[PDB]
Write an enzyme that holds these catalytic residues in place. Sequence first.
Site, PDB file in Angstrom:
ATOM      1  N   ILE A 184     -13.594   7.678  17.677  1.00 37.66           N
ATOM      2  CA  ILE A 184     -13.866   6.350  18.215  1.00 37.66           C
ATOM      3  C   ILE A 184     -13.143   5.248  17.113  1.00 37.66           C
ATOM      4  O   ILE A 184     -12.509   4.517  17.314  1.00 37.66           O
ATOM      5  CB  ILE A 184     -15.420   5.877  17.810  1.00 37.66           C
ATOM      6  CG1 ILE A 184     -16.039   6.530  19.143  1.00 37.66           C
ATOM      7  CG2 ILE A 184     -15.325   4.227  18.024  1.00 37.66           C
ATOM      8  CD1 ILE A 184     -17.558   5.990  19.503  1.00 37.66           C
ATOM      9  N   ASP A 224      -8.234   3.482  20.628  1.00 35.77           N
ATOM     10  CA  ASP A 224      -8.372   2.040  20.850  1.00 35.77           C
ATOM     11  C   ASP A 224      -9.216   1.727  21.792  1.00 35.77           C
ATOM     12  O   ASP A 224      -8.994   0.904  22.681  1.00 35.77           O
ATOM     13  CB  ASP A 224      -6.774   1.703  21.098  1.00 35.77           C
ATOM     14  CG  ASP A 224      -5.499   2.103  20.211  1.00 35.77           C
ATOM     15  OD1 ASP A 224      -5.674   2.360  19.073  1.00 35.77           O
ATOM     16  OD2 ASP A 224      -4.607   2.285  20.588  1.00 35.77           O
ATOM     17  N   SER A 273     -11.494  -1.408  25.604  1.00 37.86           N
ATOM     18  CA  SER A 273     -10.171  -1.280  25.625  1.00 37.86           C
ATOM     19  C   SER A 273      -9.431  -2.386  24.683  1.00 37.86           C
ATOM     20  O   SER A 273      -9.274  -3.537  25.104  1.00 37.86           O
ATOM     21  CB  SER A 273      -9.486  -1.172  26.839  1.00 37.86           C
ATOM     22  OG  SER A 273      -8.051  -0.951  26.875  1.00 37.86           O
ATOM     23  N   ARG A 274      -9.280  -2.007  23.304  1.00 36.12           N
ATOM     24  CA  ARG A 274      -8.953  -2.914  22.356  1.00 36.12           C
ATOM     25  C   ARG A 274      -7.498  -3.513  22.878  1.00 36.12           C
ATOM     26  O   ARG A 274      -7.269  -4.648  23.005  1.00 36.12           O
ATOM     27  CB  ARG A 274      -8.856  -2.303  20.785  1.00 36.12           C
ATOM     28  CG  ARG A 274     -10.139  -1.662  20.673  1.00 36.12           C
ATOM     29  CD  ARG A 274     -10.177  -1.006  19.380  1.00 36.12           C
ATOM     30  NE  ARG A 274     -11.343  -0.094  19.113  1.00 36.12           N
ATOM     31  CZ  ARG A 274     -11.582   0.215  17.985  1.00 36.12           C
ATOM     32  NH1 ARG A 274     -10.914   0.212  16.927  1.00 36.12           N
ATOM     33  NH2 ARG A 274     -12.688   1.264  17.980  1.00 36.12           N
ATOM     34  N   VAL A 275      -6.507  -2.602  22.849  1.00 35.45           N
ATOM     35  CA  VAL A 275      -5.056  -2.857  23.382  1.00 35.45           C
ATOM     36  C   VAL A 275      -4.646  -2.266  24.593  1.00 35.45           C
ATOM     37  O   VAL A 275      -4.095  -1.240  24.553  1.00 35.45           O
ATOM     38  CB  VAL A 275      -4.025  -2.578  22.173  1.00 35.45           C
ATOM     39  CG1 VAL A 275      -4.334  -3.277  21.210  1.00 35.45           C
ATOM     40  CG2 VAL A 275      -4.269  -1.009  21.895  1.00 35.45           C
TER      41      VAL A 275
END
Lengths: 122, 238, 239, 255, 127
Positions: free
Chosen positions: D88, D92, D117-119
């Site tokens: 984790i 991302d 979903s960060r990016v």
Amino acid sequence: ATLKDITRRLKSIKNIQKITKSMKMVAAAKYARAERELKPARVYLCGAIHSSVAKQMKLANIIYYSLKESTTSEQSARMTAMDNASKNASEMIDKLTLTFNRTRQAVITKELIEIISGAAAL
Amino acid sequence: LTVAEYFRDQEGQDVLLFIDNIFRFTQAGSEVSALLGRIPSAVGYQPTLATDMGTMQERITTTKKGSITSVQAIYVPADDLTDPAPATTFAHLDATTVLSRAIAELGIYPAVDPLDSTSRIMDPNIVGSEHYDVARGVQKILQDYKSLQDIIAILGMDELSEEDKLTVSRARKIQRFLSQPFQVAEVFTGHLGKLVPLKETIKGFQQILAGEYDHLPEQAFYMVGPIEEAVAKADKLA
Amino acid sequence: LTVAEYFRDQEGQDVLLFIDNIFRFTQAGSEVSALLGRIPSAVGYQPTLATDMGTMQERITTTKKGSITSVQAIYVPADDLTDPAPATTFAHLDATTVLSRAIAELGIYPAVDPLDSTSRIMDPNIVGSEHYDVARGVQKILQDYKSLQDIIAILGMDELSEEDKLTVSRARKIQRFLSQPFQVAEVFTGHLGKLVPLKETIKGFQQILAGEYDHLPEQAFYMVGPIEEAVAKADKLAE
Amino acid sequence: YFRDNGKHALIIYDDLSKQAVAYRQMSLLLRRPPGREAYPGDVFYLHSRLLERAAKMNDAFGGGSLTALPVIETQAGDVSAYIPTNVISITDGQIFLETELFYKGIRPAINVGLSVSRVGSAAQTRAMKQVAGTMKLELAQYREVAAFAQFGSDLDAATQQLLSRGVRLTELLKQGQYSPMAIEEQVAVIYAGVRGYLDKLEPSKITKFENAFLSHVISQHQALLGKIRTDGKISEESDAKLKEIVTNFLAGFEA
Amino acid sequence: KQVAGTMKLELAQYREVAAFAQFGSDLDAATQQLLSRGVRLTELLKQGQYSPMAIEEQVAVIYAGVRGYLDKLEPSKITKFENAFLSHVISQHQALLGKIRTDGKISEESDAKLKEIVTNFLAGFEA
């Protein structure tokens, strides 16, 4: 976390589980009769019942009427209360059992590692 | 496994391998590993826990000759399924058969718990749509009835709506239709063992769910083979 | 020990052997253990824990030559009574007085756990039937209360029957009647030291079991001497 | 290869949990010091160096890319275990698949509250933002109005609608295996629920609605789907157009 | 086997409702009865140390509880009853205990005899 502590909490919550489940059926049995007596009546920890009417509170026909509604509503709220209470208790148990097993495995691994290391240093 | 391998790789048969039990197989491993002086991993299991288990399980497969299905008895240590031993074994299981004493006490033999026993191949793209939906219906009707189990001895088995009263009877009929006389019990209980083919098994419960037999006594669906036999038994019960 | 052994054998006199703390014997060994080139055993204790303890403890005994009433203070690491040290010591005693921190925290002194202490002479054909009955009766009511505790932990209370509310009250009084002001701990109890003779001990508890003193507050027994002091204290506690 | 050749590749590691144990077997045999869970103190770097390779190259470097989808098997859903948290702290984002939801019939069992979903949002098709964007907002509200006590008499038109939408949207997100859907088809079926064309329909029929309305727009509306597909943005024309499309179907959806 | 099975079953049911006992604010006679048989059988399972009793004696005391000749007697007195009853049969009823062994089970005759003993003894115990 300490297995000794987890075991203690496990037992207590397990007691509460049984107790709650018991009270649920007891109140439910009363509610069963009450629901039936509700018909003849209208011919003339117990959930939020006391507080509810308390934050509002401060012949025979009406008295008997309300009295009969009291028992019913009381058993209703109590039944639903304990119902969810035992459910919450059960979840709490499973959660503790999981945390317990985690601590259990960790313990063994820790001691064992300490033994291996201690030996591999002679 | 080698004795079984012969039949498959030589006579191309569908052999059945029983391993009782698998846990002691792993334990013997950790022990041997320990004696060899290998450093124990988590909870003291051998590092080669993954391989030792894998290599053995991988031999149990279906080839373009025969097959070897293995019924392995499982022992879950400390009732911990996350423990390495059972955690690893589950990674090679395809189905489960939970023999519950409670079910046995109800007289349902075999005492196979119809809610715990699961199978991965129980997917429509494998066992077929009909089989899947029928199996599902059985599991569902039983679950619904279970929910009512409480209300039964609380409010009274009568307050239940028609559908609920129907689910109760049907579920009980199915529950009983789950018991099947084994040939092994012939030389004991003095009853002819039955070998119910998959087709009749599906059709049978399929009809019960349809309610086509909602008029026969529940006892008729007890310790019988094909649904037809249950019907005949019902007539005998009058 | 050797000192006591002499007085025991070559003297044939009753010798008292008080050791505090005997656990330090085992601890000292675990320290040098690593330097002696030994492989760590469970909980890192020396692999020769049991034997080392045995060779020593076995010398601390009464023989046909002399009697030695030995009283040893055994430390319990992290209060874990399952720790290889105290756990192995248990089997070398005839009487075990387990002290619980919980009871100590409550304020009951001595912090003896009435449900974890035992004696080999607690046989009805040794300490007498009456004594046995009283002791067991006290242990029982306490255990029953212990079981009722977690039951009402977070579930009110007004549900228990007359019997339950009676056992609770009695058990608590008995619990607080176990505390005895020690002369040694006078600067810790802020009270005078009291000693209660066995007869009065059996008498008092037997009477409390009978519910005779069910008309006295719990605090009337908390840190007292004979039941007489409890009754007198009760009347004294008029306000 | 593809990445450094201007092409795009996707690699799935199924699963990194078993690799970790395999590396552990090696380490322990090597007599390397066992750490937490007896795992060697470099299992992180083992997965970090690996996943680190998955990257998006800029135009100057061909403009290739390698998307990675590692799989991790948890125990009792403990997403706080060493291996899980390690992965984790490398990826991302994750997609949490709850066992309860699986048995509960929710498939894919994606816990929309833990999965992140960060990016990736910046890579989401505009058409999706125009429907999924408002969808998650509704699903957020629905999730908020929830509790373990299923037996709860709740009311209030406001919260009621939040629940009504929520359950329908959940049924819309249900999808079977081996049947992927084109982005244009997704925004179409999602549009139905988001705009509320499913509010006046039984929750059970929602699934049936999808397995009827979908083929309905695929067949007699290839033009509309094609527009949204090419533009990648639902224009006002296509929007009002789709409004009629769904309405016409609602007026004739047999149940 | 004869008396072991019934006791075991009864004890099981007891445990299933054991928790509801201490919270018996309102229970149905059925559950209450299960608790009654339960506690009595539990008392019968008590045995002094250094005093192992014969199988005939065991089945005899089990008979008392299983057949319900103790459901009314207060649990505290059950322990006393067992003592007085057993000691009584071992005295003026060695024949019955012996017959049980000879027959290898509780014969109908001995079943009727024990019935008359337990009933008459009960009254004598509570009088």
